[PDB]
Structure formats: structure tokens, C-alpha cells
């Protein structure tokens, strides 16, 4: 099962990871049996 959790919050920081607490809600649940070891992101 491939699971993804997501969260979108505003922040005023520029060049730092904000200090705070925020839980992440589940988004979807994909029932596909892949044995995964690698990934890559996309840019526009």
C-alpha cells in the first residue's frame, strides 16, 4: 500500500526551516504492489 500524507501551512521564514509543530493528515491510499527503492522530483 502506497500512502501519502500532506500539510500546507503559511510561513514567513525565508532561509530557514520554521520551528513549530503541525500534524500531517492522510491524503490518499494507493493499493498497488510495487517494490520501490528509488525516486526523483520534477521541476517546471
Amino acid at each position: 500500500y502506497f500512502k501519502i500524507y500532506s500539510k500546507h501551512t503559511p510561513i514567513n521564514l525565508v532561509r530557514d526551516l520554521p520551528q513549530g509543530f503541525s500534524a500531517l493528515e492522510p491524503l490518499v491510499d494507493l493499493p498497488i504492489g510495487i517494490n520501490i527503492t528509488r525516486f526523483q522530483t520534477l521541476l517546471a
Partner: protein, 49 residues
């Protein structure tokens, strides 16, 4: 093929369904039966299994 052909020579459409079980999450299922809700009485409930 021709309508004049006998019963043993008329076309017969055939469809074969194959069912597989393997190490993957289950996808196809039969329709699940449901019943009307009963409140304020001692009942045996089956909520999502």
C-alpha cells in the same frame, strides 16, 4: 457461417473469464450487502467488517 447451417454448425460466441490470486492488494470484490440502521436497541452491529 450461414443461417441454413444445422444446429451443430451455427456460430457460438464464447467468453472465458480467468480469476487470479497473487501477492498484490485485492481490487475486485462482490457487492456488499447492507441493512437498515436500528437505534436505541441491543443489536449486533457489523460496521465495515
Amino acid at each position: 457461417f450461414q443461417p441454413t447451417n444445422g444446429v451443430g454448425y451455427q456460430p457460438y460466441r464464447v467468453v472465458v473469464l480467468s480469476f487470479e490470486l497473487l501477492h498484490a492488494p485485492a481490487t475486485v470484490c462482490g457487492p456488499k450487502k447492507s441493512t437498515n440502521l436500528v437505534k436505541n436497541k441491543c443489536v449486533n452491529f457489523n460496521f465495515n467488517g
